[PDB]
Design a protein around this ligand. Sequence first.
Ligand SMILES: [Cu+2]
Ligand SMILES: [Cu+2]
Ligand SMILES: [Cu+2]
Ligand SMILES: [Cu+2]
Ligand SMILES: [Zn+2]
Ligand SMILES: [Zn+2]
Lengths: 155, 155
Amino acid sequence: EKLVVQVQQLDPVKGNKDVGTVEITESAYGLVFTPHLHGLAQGLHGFHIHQNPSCEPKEKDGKLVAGLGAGGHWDPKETKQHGYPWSDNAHLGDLPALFVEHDGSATNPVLAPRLKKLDEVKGHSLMIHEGGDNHSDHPAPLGGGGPRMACGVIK
Amino acid sequence: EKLVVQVQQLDPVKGNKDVGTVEITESAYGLVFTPHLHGLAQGLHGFHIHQNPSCEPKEKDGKLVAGLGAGGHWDPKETKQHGYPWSDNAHLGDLPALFVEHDGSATNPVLAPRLKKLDEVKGHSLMIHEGGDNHSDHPAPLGGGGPRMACGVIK
Ligand SMILES: [Cu+2]
Ligand SMILES: [Cu+2]
Ligand SMILES: [Cu+2]
Ligand SMILES: [Cu+2]
Ligand SMILES: [Zn+2]
Ligand SMILES: [Zn+2]
């Protein structure tokens, strides 16, 4: 009847810290992602489900870049393109952008109409990027979210 | 096909300001509302379809109140409750909250899964509130939206 994702802000060098959680429920129109995050940068952020059920980084050129353990966006239907949460051409893991209040709190729930059961999302990660999401691979790849600001494993 | 709603920032004393449009299109999972608004107050705002095809103010106790001519939330199924966009117990006009960037712009689209055809929404109004939306009538009625900030007639 529910799923509570332990969301933590990413940081390879010093350490991961718990920013709150995200509960995933089923509605008659798809999975609902309701967060109770506190202490994040304000604004709209890219919100997507990734491949590997891990939130640990991967260094490159010495410079460790957070969240790479998660891999790319979850794409079991191999569309090979980033898009809208309501488009069949998009990665199945593409969710609506997440809003973080002026006080760093995320409490506005979003719907992923293409996901029906809680089981589908298990064994994958939940990523929250630094930038937004224009739901296209242009002008920037993967909606332009960029650096991975927060993450959590869906168990 | 597409419906282009001309939206105005409401001000009965100084005069309304043209702030952009909201395009309504049909997706495989419901109606998509794509804004391109400018000059609005930043933050998360209540976003709903109201009964009457009007954005006119009405006088109440000596002063004009912005947008009262739009009537209440569109409720064809007569649920009598304000709720979530994915709940069948909520007014059919209940849409996901609209995010306005720190620069006053709104460009992030939202989905109303319970609405399927463009014609359904014609003959009504699209309202953007000063306050937010918790998708319940408690603690504040109609999700806590409060005053009517911007509005457009759906033709
Ligand atoms: Cu809290
Ligand atoms: Cu991502
Ligand atoms: Cu513009
Ligand atoms: Cu309203
Ligand atoms: Zn994607
Ligand atoms: Zn309502």
